[PDB]
Ligand binder design. Structure first.
Ligand SMILES: COc1cncc(-c2ccccc2C(=O)Nc2cnn(C)c2)c1
Lengths: 39, 156
């Protein structure tokens, strides 16, 4: 059985930690909603 | 139950203790999450029940109590924030520049941030705090890290 609990407000935070790269990837999306890499 | 706007954890007591299976967004009285989090099952909010209203396995999205309300889109240029809600950890904003998933039906923004699977459904925001999509459906790259699409629904 599933339940929900509040975790916070949805706001943009100034001076948040900035991380992660920006990759450009060729992908395919199947009928089951699964993404896969096309090479 | 609680219907105030905000980000929420999706929990289950079926497994050992209380386990976080995902995250969602409450906006305009409608709860938005990813299909793989609930599999379309009903939800509890205190003593109140939330029934599914719309869902689609291919989009990997589901809304409760009403139709999908989130319609903001990534502009294709600017940095965004993942409002990550990891299991047993405080909500934390992480800023990043999205990459792109190129598909036969068009390009989609993508966020290269790695979090536990129970973080699926955390919202991605623009500079005005508008939800431009949810985190949690993507691919495993050569490195072993996850790259999630910026998955957004359609406001009918
Ligand atoms: C446990 O190791 C993992 C392996 N693969 C993916 C993840 C993961 C990481 C971050 C956010 C979401 C996920 C995730 O599981 N996504 C998903 C999409 N559809 N389904 C059915 C599951 C984790």
């Amino acid at each position: 059985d599933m339940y929900i609990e509040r975790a916070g407000d949805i706001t943009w935070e100034k001076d948040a930690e900035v991380t992660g790269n920006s990759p450009r990837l060729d992908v395919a999306l199947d009928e089951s909603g699964d993404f896969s890499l096309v090479e | 139950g609680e219907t105030t706007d905000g980000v929420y954890r999706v929990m289950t007591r079926r497994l050992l203790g209380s386990t976080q299976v995902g995250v969602g967004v409450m906006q305009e009285g409608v709860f938005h999450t990813m299909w793989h989090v609930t599999k379309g099952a009903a939800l509890r909010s205190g003593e109140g029940r939330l029934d599914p209203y719309w869902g689609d396995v291919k989009q990997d999205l589901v809304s409760y109590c009403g139709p999908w309300k989130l319609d903001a889109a990534w502009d294709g240029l600017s940095e965004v924030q993942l409002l990550a809600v990891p299991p047993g950890e405080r909500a934390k904003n992480i800023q990043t520049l999205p990459g792109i998933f190129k598909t036969k039906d068009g390009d989609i923004g993508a966020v290269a941030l790695d979090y536990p699977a129970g973080t699926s459904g955390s919202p991605i925001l623009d500079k005005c705090g508008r939800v431009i999509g949810l985190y949690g459906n993507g691919v495993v790259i050569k490195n072993g890290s996850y790259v999630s699409a910026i998955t957004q629904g359609k406001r009918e």
